[PDB]
Amino acid sequence: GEQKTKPTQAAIKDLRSLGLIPDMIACRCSEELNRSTIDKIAMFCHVGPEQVVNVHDVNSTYHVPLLLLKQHMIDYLHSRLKLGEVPLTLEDKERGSQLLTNWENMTKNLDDSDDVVKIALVGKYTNLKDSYLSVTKSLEHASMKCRRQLEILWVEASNLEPETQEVDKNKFHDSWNKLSSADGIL
Amino acid sequence: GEQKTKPTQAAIKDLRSLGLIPDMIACRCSEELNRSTIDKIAMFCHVGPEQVVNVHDVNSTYHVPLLLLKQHMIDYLHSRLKLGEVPLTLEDKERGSQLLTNWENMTKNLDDSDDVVKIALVGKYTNLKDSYLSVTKSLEHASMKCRRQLEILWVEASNLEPETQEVDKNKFHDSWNKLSSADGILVPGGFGTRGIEGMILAAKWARESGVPFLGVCLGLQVAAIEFARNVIGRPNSSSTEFLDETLLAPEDQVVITMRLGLRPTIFQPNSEWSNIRKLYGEVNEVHERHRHRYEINPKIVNDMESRGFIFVGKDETGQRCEIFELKGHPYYVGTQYHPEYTSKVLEPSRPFWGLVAAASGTLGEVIKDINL
Amino acid sequence: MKYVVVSGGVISGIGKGVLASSTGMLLKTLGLKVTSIKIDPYMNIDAGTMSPLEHGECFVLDDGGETDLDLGNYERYLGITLSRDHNITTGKIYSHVISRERRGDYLGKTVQIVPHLTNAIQDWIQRVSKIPVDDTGLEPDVCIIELGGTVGDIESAPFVEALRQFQFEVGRENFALIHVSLVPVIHGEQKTKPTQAAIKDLRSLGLIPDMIACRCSEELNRSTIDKIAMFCHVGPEQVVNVHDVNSTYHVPLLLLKQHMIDYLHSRLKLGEVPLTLEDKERGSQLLTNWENMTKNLDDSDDVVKIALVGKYTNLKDSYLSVTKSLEHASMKCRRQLEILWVEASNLEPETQEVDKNKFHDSWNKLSSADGILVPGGFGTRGIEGMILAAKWARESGVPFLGVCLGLQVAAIEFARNVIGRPNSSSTEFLDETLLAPEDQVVITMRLGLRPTIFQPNSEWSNIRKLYGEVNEVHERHRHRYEINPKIVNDMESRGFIFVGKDETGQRCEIFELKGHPYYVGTQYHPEYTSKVLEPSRPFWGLVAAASGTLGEVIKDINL
Numbered sequence A: 001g002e003q004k005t006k007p008t009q010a011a012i013k014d015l016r017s018l019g020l021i022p023d024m025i026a027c028r029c030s031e032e033l034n035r036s037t038i039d040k041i042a043m044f045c046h047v048g049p050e051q052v053v054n055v056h057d058v059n060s061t062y063h064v065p066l067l068l069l070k071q072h073m074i075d076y077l078h079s080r081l082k083l084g085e086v087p088l089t090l091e092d093k094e095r096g097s098q099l100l101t102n103w104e105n106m107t108k109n110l111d112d113s114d115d116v117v118k119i120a121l122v123g124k125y126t127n128l129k130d131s132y133l134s135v136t137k138s139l140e141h142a143s144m145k146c147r148r149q150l151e152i153l154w155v156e157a158s159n160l161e162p163e164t165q166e167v168d169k170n171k172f173h174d175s176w177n178k179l180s181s182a183d184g185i186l
Numbered sequence B: 001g002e003q004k005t006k007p008t009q010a011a012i013k014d015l016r017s018l019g020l021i022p023d024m025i026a027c028r029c030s031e032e033l034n035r036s037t038i039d040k041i042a043m044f045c046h047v048g049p050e051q052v053v054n055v056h057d058v059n060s061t062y063h064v065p066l067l068l069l070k071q072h073m074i075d076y077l078h079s080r081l082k083l084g085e086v087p088l089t090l091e092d093k094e095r096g097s098q099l100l101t102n103w104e105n106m107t108k109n110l111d112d113s114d115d116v117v118k119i120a121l122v123g124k125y126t127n128l129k130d131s132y133l134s135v136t137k138s139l140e141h142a143s144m145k146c147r148r149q150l151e152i153l154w155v156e157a158s159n160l161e162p163e164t165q166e167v168d169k170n171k172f173h174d175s176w177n178k179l180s181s182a183d184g185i186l187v188p189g190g191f192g193t194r195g196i197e198g199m200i201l202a203a204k205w206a207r208e209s210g211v212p213f214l215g216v217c218l219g220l221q222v223a224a225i226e227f228a229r230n231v232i233g234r235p236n237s238s239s240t241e242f243l244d245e246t247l248l249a250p251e252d253q254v255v256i257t258m259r260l261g262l263r264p265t266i267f268q269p270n271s272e273w274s275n276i277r278k279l280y281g282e283v284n285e286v287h288e289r290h291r292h293r294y295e296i297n298p299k300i301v302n303d304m305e306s307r308g309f310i311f312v313g314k315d316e317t318g319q320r321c322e323i324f325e326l327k328g329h330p331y332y333v334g335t336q337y338h339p340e341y342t343s344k345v346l347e348p349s350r351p352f353w354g355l356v357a358a359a360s361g362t363l364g365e366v367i368k369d370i371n372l
Numbered sequence C: 001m002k003y004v005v006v007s008g009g010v011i012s013g014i015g016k017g018v019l020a021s022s023t024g025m026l027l028k029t030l031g032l033k034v035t036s037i038k039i040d041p042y043m044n045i046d047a048g049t050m051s052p053l054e055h056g057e058c059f060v061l062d063d064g065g066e067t068d069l070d071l072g073n074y075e076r077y078l079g080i081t082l083s084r085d086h087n088i089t090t091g092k093i094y095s096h097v098i099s100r101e102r103r104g105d106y107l108g109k110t111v112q113i114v115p116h117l118t119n120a121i122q123d124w125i126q127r128v129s130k131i132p133v134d135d136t137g138l139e140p141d142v143c144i145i146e147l148g149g150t151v152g153d154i155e156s157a158p159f160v161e162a163l164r165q166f167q168f169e170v171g172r173e174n175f176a177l178i179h180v181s182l183v184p185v186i187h188g189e190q191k192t193k194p195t196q197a198a199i200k201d202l203r204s205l206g207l208i209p210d211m212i213a214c215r216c217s218e219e220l221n222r223s224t225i226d227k228i229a230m231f232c233h234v235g236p237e238q239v240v241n242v243h244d245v246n247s248t249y250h251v252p253l254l255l256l257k258q259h260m261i262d263y264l265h266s267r268l269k270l271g272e273v274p275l276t277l278e279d280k281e282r283g284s285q286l287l288t289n290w291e292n293m294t295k296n297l298d299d300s301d302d303v304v305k306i307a308l309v310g311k312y313t314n315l316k317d318s319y320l321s322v323t324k325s326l327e328h329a330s331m332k333c334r335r336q337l338e339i340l341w342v343e344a345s346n347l348e349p350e351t352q353e354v355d356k357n358k359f360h361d362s363w364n365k366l367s368s369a370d371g372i373l374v375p376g377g378f379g380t381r382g383i384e385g386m387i388l389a390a391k392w393a394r395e396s397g398v399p400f401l402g403v404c405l406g407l408q409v410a411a412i413e414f415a416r417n418v419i420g421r422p423n424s425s426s427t428e429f430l431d432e433t434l435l436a437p438e439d440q441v442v443i444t445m446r447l448g449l450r451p452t453i454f455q456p457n458s459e460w461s462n463i464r465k466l467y468g469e470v471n472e473v474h475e476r477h478r479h480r481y482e483i484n485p486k487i488v489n490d491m492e493s494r495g496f497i498f499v500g501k502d503e504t505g506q507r508c509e510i511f512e513l514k515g516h517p518y519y520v521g522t523q524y525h526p527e528y529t530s531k532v533l534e535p536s537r538p539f540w541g542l543v544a545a546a547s548g549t550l551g552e553v554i555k556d557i558n559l
């Protein structure tokens, strides 16, 4: 039950040693960081406590930018890199603030989309989901644009082959069950 | 929370009035009858309290005889009808006490059989389960003989038809899900024609996906229609039972005005390899109960006989086709008689014992239990 | 005059008493001066001989008439006061006409049970329905008769004949029959043949039914109603269903959704009865009080836990009036009720030698309670548990009401644990010891509605605030044994102040303990006088103190 900031303080020592100086301290804790945990990380690293961002899990990874925006990270980076001195047109700036509202809209659509769509992804090595990371992510974009919540049905394709019935019937039924249950097939 | 014996006491009054006198008072309470409930029923009816049998629910209806046997009902009926005065041989009596041990054995086997077998029953009107009571009961006999516990998957056949996807996708998925989950498949001798395309798709699935299959009556006939459309390659081939006044040439059936009752089925000569003939003990003739107006058009048989759909059994004239088994599949059978009706609780109907054995695995071990 | 007879049943446990107590309530919303009669087929003269173990509590009327439970259900639903004549019994009417024989009044004829005894029933119902029952001496407009037993019995037999003659000796259109009936469900199918085998017997015994009030487990199917309306001669609109709903105070409003006032207004021509606006507007206002209190039950969530501490708690009907008074007090506070059944003998330390689980569960339930009730027990064998709960309620500050025996164990507790006499005793129990510290004395019975006068200094007493500060209280009594009045001057000095006494001054009837949030004894029974829209003031006090906001209830009373 205690937050342990000594692995972090033993990588701030090495960072200063290898010679870069840190600006943010972006913790991957299992929790919200305690106000006393941030205060001690800001005592052992030289960052101010406003800069000790927490990057904890939220309902999908498309929310993560908006957590960092609640945690002042644009207001800090605008200061710490003097981004007001970069030349921008209104065609830059208004595309910027419009893209923010597209991200606020698509994350709001994810927050109350309920109507499921089941897509069967049919192939080898489905236990290695990262072997298909771009396939998965493209279905997530397509999902949020349709405003239907996604379930992907992992069909390990070799199990659909009738010879599987000679080896394990459970695999033959589960795979054809997942395929038959799917609203669409890939 | 109180047991109410006044509906009973208001049917004992009417019984005495209409003039019969009762012996037993067989209550259908939701519970065990209280000792005070029995004592009052034995005060208002004139039976002694030992005779007020309770017939409450137990783990399957095949246990009910053994509840009545715990409740002294043979010892009472042996006295009250003087059954010791009836003449019996040892061939009667020892068959009697042996049949009791077969019932004690099959109920003990039901009490600790756990390994499930899922059979898809594919047809119209599955919400009216009593429309198939004999089909269900024959699978229960076949189940208990295999020592696998039964689940039957009700597939309302019209939901398998692709047009259902235009009406409700949930029905299209649930029905194909139940069919895909099944360890074995049954086309259960339906009535009318309006679900037939779903019964054809389940027969396509059962042939190509290797799943164990039994077609009863209409089930043999959709299997011939499936095989014609999907292996012989005539996609316009049709149930003459349905698509009649079109007058098309690829007729899988013909009317031959009724045919009913127990009839003789003779096995065709080469049939030795057929699993269905192993299940009938390899005996040359089978006596089973029929219903059909429409039968397979016998002018297609020489094609099916060439393509591995071999008509294992025929009518005594040779002209009518009554059993087929498909070559090179674990168990895929049509029977145009009804095998349901002849099943007994200690003698499951051989095609249904075949299906529940193939779906359980150990179809070979059942073929030894029969032929030894 | 008009009559509605509630009757019937394939089985006697079917629950006619709600349909009676709820039909009469619906007719009172038309503003009619409704009354009710119970028929009980048992041979008891009156309930005083039969112990609370044997089919529930021993009720009390203004007369002192110890009576059937079912009188109480009409009193509390209808706001009426009844008399011991409103309970017709096989005991009473046969004792009446057989005593009348030795008096000679049939002029030495035969006193056959046909003609003469069924004539005494028809006379008794016509006497009784003209006795006044509301706050003014006006005679009733409509009488609800609840026919106990079933139609088709041998204990029912003179009543069903008497009521066949009474269908004519009072004209049709001044009489209506409601037949309660059983429609079993088996294998998923509604079975209307028990009902059709009690409509045959009803027609045979000679009454004709108007309603067919089924106690099915379900909503009746439209096809089930259509067949009951084919075999009984009622139209399908009249086949009322009386299925379970979130509390029994909703049942009148289900019958009102099922047209039952619109039917009874037609079938008894109730538009021809003379009513004032003071009748009619009281009628339609009382309907809105019932719609309001049922709406308050539908979304009250904040629980209040009351410990009911006594013997025989497995026989909950031994306390039916106690339970029902807490339900009225609950709905008036707008807190949802849980009652904690504390089987009092389990609180006694010797229980720890027999079963520790009982000793912990009972003290756990008592410790969990937001308020505590000693509910006027009977016999003596649980008394030490009721004393320990009174010690707990005094020292731990928890809200407390002692009813009857409850006031008496509170005096025994206070004597043993504050005055310091550990040998002080219930003279109701420990009699032939002849000890000097007697907390009680026998004074041979005292029954019925009696006058309680408040003692002079009483102004500060929360119980006197709950009675509206009125100088006299009229409430129903039962007690052989009363507090020994020679201890009172000690208790009066120690802060246990006797707020109320009998008109002679010599008998003690209420106390309140100084310096506790709410700790009351009442030696009368406050249960019986509670109505569904007027909860009994000591019980409204308890459920208010346990809910918090006892002060806000004292404004709702005194404004």
Ligand SMILES: Nc1ccn([C@@H]2O[C@H](COP(=O)(O)OP(=O)(O)OP(=O)(O)O)[C@@H](O)[C@H]2O)c(=O)n1
Pocket: A003, A004, A005, A006, A007, A009
């Ligand atoms: N760089 C540091 C940090 C701490 N301490 C000492 O080590 C003790 C134990 O370390 P801990 O209290 O656990 O400090 P944290 O940095 O919080 O370690 P963790 O985050 O794992 O709890 C502290 O009381 C302190 O006296 C030290 O010597 N050097």
Ligand SMILES: Nc1ccn([C@@H]2O[C@H](COP(=O)(O)OP(=O)(O)OP(=O)(O)O)[C@@H](O)[C@H]2O)c(=O)n1
Pocket: B003, B004, B005, B006, B007, B009, C010, C011, C012, C013, C149, C150, C153, C154, C155, C156
């Ligand atoms: N044939 C009968 C049976 C009972 N009674 C009387 O009817 C009363 C109520 O019937 P009940 O006590 O309910 O008897 P049961 O037959 O048990 O009815 P149920 O089974 O429905 O409880 C009984 O106390 C008894 O005096 C009667 O008159 N005739």
Ligand SMILES: Nc1ccn([C@@H]2O[C@H](COP(=O)(O)OP(=O)(O)OP(=O)(O)O)[C@@H](O)[C@H]2O)c(=O)n1
Pocket: C012, C013, C014, C015, C016, C017, C018, C021, C073, C148, C149, C248, C317, C320
């Ligand atoms: N308005 C009502 C009427 C009845 N009851 C409950 O009903 C009980 C007893 O059943 P009742 O309906 O009075 O009838 P029975 O006792 O079944 O008797 P009978 O059918 O012979 O009239 C008690 O537990 C009481 O709590 C209630 O809570 N509220």
Ligand SMILES: Nc1ccn([C@@H]2O[C@H](COP(=O)(O)OP(=O)(O)OP(=O)(O)O)[C@@H](O)[C@H]2O)c(=O)n1
Pocket: C190, C191, C192, C193, C194, C196
């Ligand atoms: N008074 C009656 C009612 C019905 N029947 C016959 O009895 C058969 C079986 O009765 P049932 O169909 O069960 O009628 P119900 O009155 O509904 O019986 P239950 O309510 O128990 O279902 C009916 O088909 C009908 O032909 C009869 O002879 N006499």
Ligand SMILES: [Mg+2]
Pocket: C012
């Ligand atoms: Mg009874």
Ligand SMILES: [Mg+2]
Pocket: C015, C016, C017, C070
């Ligand atoms: Mg009752």
